[PDB]
């Protein structure tokens, strides 16, 4: 259908779990932006699969996993993920137009982070996107032709010369990078395809397509909490730029929202709770950089739902809240005496206004609406009424099957 | 509705004309990407309006013109456009999240162009987008607070120091840029708004929104003829990233296609015709850098229609073809003995396969389907059948009113 799964907060909402849970019903599962800054996590029958760039349809061999054109690819790292699975040939395809992360990029990221202090993943995501905007970047299809690759590498070496000292590239950068591609190009080349053509066709034939967002909406380069964002567009619309699909192809948009909020890295966080009331969240939800913890923020949620056109919500990680005395929800902002109901473009001086809810004790592992505590259902009802989007999926532990459908 | 007007070739298709022609029927007209690399041109009653970043609803005072968040803004240049119109306050709004083009950017563009030779507009578009990906860029909202602006300017000056020689910035860069903002910030600040909120609301209230693409689909940074592209996403999906609108809000997608093709700048162009058969196109269609001229390319058109989800086409500049003996249409590609029907990701060795059509003599200024020569209608019929999208608008001169609706 091109349905889309999107994180509607600042990442870590539980996207990997939801994609894995529904992927069996699709022909294609598509990672459309970001890189291995992502960590989409699947748990099933006590086995944890930590994915980075590998799409989250990988546990269903009939699914075709697509890494689309707006992604940035650390080839070595993707090769390491490929090696963990059997017979990925014919069920993983990497866009020939995806951009390639070089070691300069990670070094540059660390260098710039000394002044900017965004809290990046230090994986060179941003600098890879920069080179894409410069139109100097290498793309996956370049690896298919030794002569083209060699030429682009020589232009890169020439271009980075003035930076070797600053970014601490070392004496052997150029020989090391040559050898890198000698090692990894043969490993990844069989998977490189025109995925744009592939998805245009699939859409035309009415095959079922699931688009897997990374990061989350409030990390969007344009509309998120800039400059405390990633360098890619994270919303549902981005899925129908990366891919070849058009906006009219988008059917369901599933907004993945944790039952509380996190950020990892710096930047504004209106509902962050550094008081003892937040300590439960830290104990069970901070954890690898520990996440900043706080409450669900309906102001921000409503904003993200509008940006994405969510048709349904998945409410994630209810089990983290088990045992908490009370749950707060940020229902509005106070800014110097004004009540704000709408998410503003600058969060300066925005203080959360909270409603308090009774906690629950034992959502963990519940598989039926009937088996949930009243206080859980009361919370769900409040959220979906305030936001105006039905909660259709409820996750009660990391396990694939600990998921309730409505 | 959020309808979208998109250029489905490499720019210069006649977008400005179509937006101006239909804008009276909308509440909002939104420029969603690019900058003053654009030149959307309107002619009405013998007056030519050359727009660059100003949206093409400006001649209808009841329209609200929006410059959205994914645009890059040369403030001085926008101020110069503002000064050509009366009472723009309350009918032009500039996103507080739009990025700001600095003089370093244009210089950097010219510097890099010595090695890359893309054929950019040398307006610093690409380097502005680079700084956006770096998350070091200045945005329009920063101009609203003198202290914030001063801080970002000081970080910029520190960051550009190693480049002053290379990019030939000059002794007085820093004092000149300080004075620039002293001059232009007061002029532009009244127009700076949260346009994301504004369009979310308008969409919720069912107000009519027209989204005005710049450049064209084959210039898209991800899916166009990389590296001979612009540094922004140009398709209909990009309109529902920049803006706050979601993909489900998109209704009509009007693909603007010239009756022949141009490119300006370097890069692949399968249907380019440098033979005498193309000379008519050059005489009447090259013209300020002259455009490379060639034939309509249905392979590329079908690709762009899929990317955008076009619901209708506008066929533009029929008058340029008046007097030509014969018109060719590229219906497929030959690549080393293989017939390709689908646009590939690499145009190496793709040679056009042509069908030839009889020309016409006097489409210029015709306002009724009935008054068109048969050979014009035969061409239209062929195009819309091969592409599978109805031609609903036909332009027979630059003049607003020389437009036929079906
Ligand atoms: O998967 C993710 N989860 C949470 N935050 C992320 C993720 N990927 C990137 N980020 C955040 O996005 C911002 C930019 O990091 P970058 O994507 O490495 O440039 C930082 O705040 C990161 O911590
Ligand atoms: O309005 C436009 N018309 C046609 N080509 C454009 C336009 N804007 C940018 N381009 C082209 O897009 C490419 C990149 O230019 P840039 O947008 O200045 O970086 C070049 O091929 C330009 O000639
Ligand atoms: C849930 C969670 C993840 C995984 O979430 P995705 O959206 O699948 O990336 C990662 N880290 C933390 C701390 C989490 O709570
Ligand atoms: C038509 C045309 C333009 C204007 O087209 P837009 O899509 O409005 O930018 C500019 N230059 C040339 C050569 C043209 O033919």
Author numbering:
A (entry chain A), B (entry chain A): 1 to 287, 293 to 411
Paper text:
C-His tag AdSS was complexed with two out of its three substrates (IMP and Asp) and with PLP, in the presence of Mg2+. GTP was omitted, as according to the studies described above it competes with PLP, hence we expect to find PLP in the GTP-binding site. Our findings reveal that the AdSS-ligand complex crystallises in the I 1 2 1 space group, with a monoclinic unit cell of dimensions 69.9 Å, 62.1 Å, 119.3 Å, 90.0°, 98.9°, 90.0°. The asymmetric unit contains one monomer of the protein (thus half of the functionally capable enzyme). Ligands bound in the active site are IMP and PLP, even though before crystallisation AdSS was preincubated with four potential ligands: IMP, Asp, PLP and Mg2+. However, the long side chain of Arg135 from the neighbouring subunit extends towards the active site of the paired monomer and participates in the ligand binding, namely in binding of IMP, thus indicating the necessity of a dimeric architecture for the formation of the catalytically active AdSS. Phosphate group of PLP is clearly visible in the electron density. It is located in the position of β phosphate group of GTP (GDP), and it maintains the hydrogen bond network of this phosphate group, namely forms hydrogen bonds with backbone atoms of Lys15 and Gly14, and with Nζ of Lys15. The aromatic ring of PLP is bound covalently to the side chain atom Nζ of Lys322 utilising for this purpose the aldehyde group of PLP.
Enzymes belonging to the purine salvage pathway are potential targets for novel drugs against H. pylori, as recent studies have shown that this bacterium is unable to synthesise purine nucleotides de novo. Furthermore, its growth was notably hampered in a medium abundant in nutrients. These results strongly suggest that AdSS is critical for the survival of H. pylori. Using a broad set of microbiological, physicochemical (UV absorption, LC-MS, X-ray analysis) and in silico experiments, we were able to prove that PLP inhibits adenylosuccinate synthetase (AdSS) from H. pylori by the competition with GTP (IC50eq ∼30 nM). The core of the enzyme comprises a β-sheet composed of 9 β-strands (8 mutually parallel and one anti-parallel), flanked by more than 10 α-helices of various length.
